[PDB]
């Protein structure tokens, strides 16, 4: 695939003001430089690759002289480098050098620093090479039980993306994340686990919601938004479920969060065509337009009243 | 543009037999909106996908 057809997570349009560093200069700075010179050389290499330069000669230099460094900035820059660097031959085979990088990912998933583990798990969400993920699966699973919520929330996202792209690597993922969701206390970890179940196994997400449905009003706004998204998707696929969730969505119209009120009103209109339900949703939109000071909100919520009128 | 000529084989809608609460299943607007934003929505009308 050409760099233009490839998935692009990062764009950097830095004017290359100074003479573009020669590949030999970059190689010398990466091999012999101090941590600062290596950091600046690695930044330049990332910017050059993002701007369409192919630097295949630097791959082994980075593996040998930069990858074993324990500097936090270099560790993060290396994750951006591994996001953009070609990992396969033109014929789609994994580069032999990537086996050495896979052991570094395994070490970083076991790193004593929780932010290195979490950042590595976030990077693994962007990996499309199943052969690199397979040897990491035991370390990724162990990150679900990590003491820090920062590691656990990113481990759920990594498992979700691995299951979505490569189901055969983790066929038990929906069950593992359901058991995680039931036992979790952190609101961000709960949201990420629930979000995975919405996309991977809606029935397990509904089973969890059915245990907590009377408590949804007491949940944080982030978890309420993802619950409203589940209710929308489930009732859209299966109109018979609408009768079950109308009461929950109506309670969310009284949420303290204006974002939850907006999403609950939008969902209520999709659950019920009854005049009383439409009136409650329309009043919630009118109240949002009057109470919200931001003209962006006023205009967009007015467009929802215009869409309602088209029926 | 909405008045499609009713064909002889088109379904006859018996309003007396339809339950009053059948909301027309709108397409999932969130998924359509996401596909449109990514540029993966083939424009329905102009690019006959069999062109």
């Amino acid at each position: 695939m050409t760099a233009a057809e490839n998935v692009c997570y990062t764009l950097i349009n830095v004017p290359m003001d100074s003479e573009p560093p020669s590949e030999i200069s970059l190689k010398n700075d990466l091999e012999k430089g101090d941590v600062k010179s290596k950091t600046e050389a690695l930044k330049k290499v990332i910017i050059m690759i993002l701007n369409g330069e192919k630097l295949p000669g630097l791959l082994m230099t980075i593996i040998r002289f930069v990858l074993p460094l324990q500097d936090h900035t270099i560790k993060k820059l290396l994750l951006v480098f591994w996001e953009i660097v070609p990992k396969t031959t033109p014929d789609g085979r994994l580069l032999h050098e990537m086996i050495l990088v896979c052991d570094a990912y395994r070490k970083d998933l076991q790193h004593p620093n929780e932010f290195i583990r979490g950042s590595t798990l976030r990077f693994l969400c962007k990996l499309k090479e199943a052969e690199l993920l397979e040897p990491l699966m035991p370390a990724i699973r162990a990150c679900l039980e990590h003491r820090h919520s920062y590691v656990r929330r990113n481990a759920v996202l990594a498992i979700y993306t691995i299951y979505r792209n490569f189901e055969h690597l983790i066929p038990d993922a929906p069950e593992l994340i359901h058991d995680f969701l039931v036992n979790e206390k952190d609101a961000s970890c709960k949201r990420n686990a629930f979000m995975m179940l919405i996309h991977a196994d809606q029935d397990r997400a509904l089973d969890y919601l059915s245990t907590c449905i009377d408590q949804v009003q007491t949940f944080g706004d982030i978890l309420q938004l993802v619950i409203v998204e589940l209710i929308y998707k489930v009732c859209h696929a299966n109109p018979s479920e609408r009768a079950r969730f109308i009461r929950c969505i109506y309670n969310l119209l009284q949420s303290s969060s204006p974002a939850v009120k907006y999403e609950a009103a939008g969902t209520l209109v999709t659950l019920s065509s009854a005049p009383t339900a439409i009136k409650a949703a329309a009043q919630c939109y009118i109240d949002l337009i009057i109470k919200e000071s931001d003209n962006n909100v006023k205009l967009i919520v007015l467009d929802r009243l215009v869409e309602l009128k088209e029926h | 543009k909405r008045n499609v000529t009713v064909q002889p084989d088109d379904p006859i809608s018996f309003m007396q037999l339809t339950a009053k609460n059948e909301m027309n299943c709108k397409e999932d607007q969130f998924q359509l909106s996401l596909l449109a934003a990514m540029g993966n929505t083939q424009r329905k009308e102009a690019a006959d996908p069999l062109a």
Partner: peptide, 24 residues
């Protein structure tokens, strides 16, 4: 034995009863 005014959730029940009266 004081007269109790206002039950929590009555507004949601009134909304649901209106929707039922509209055929939902």
């Amino acid at each position: 034995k004081a007269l109790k005014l206002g039950a929590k959730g009555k507004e949601v029940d009134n909304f649901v009863d209106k929707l039922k009266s509209e055929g939902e």
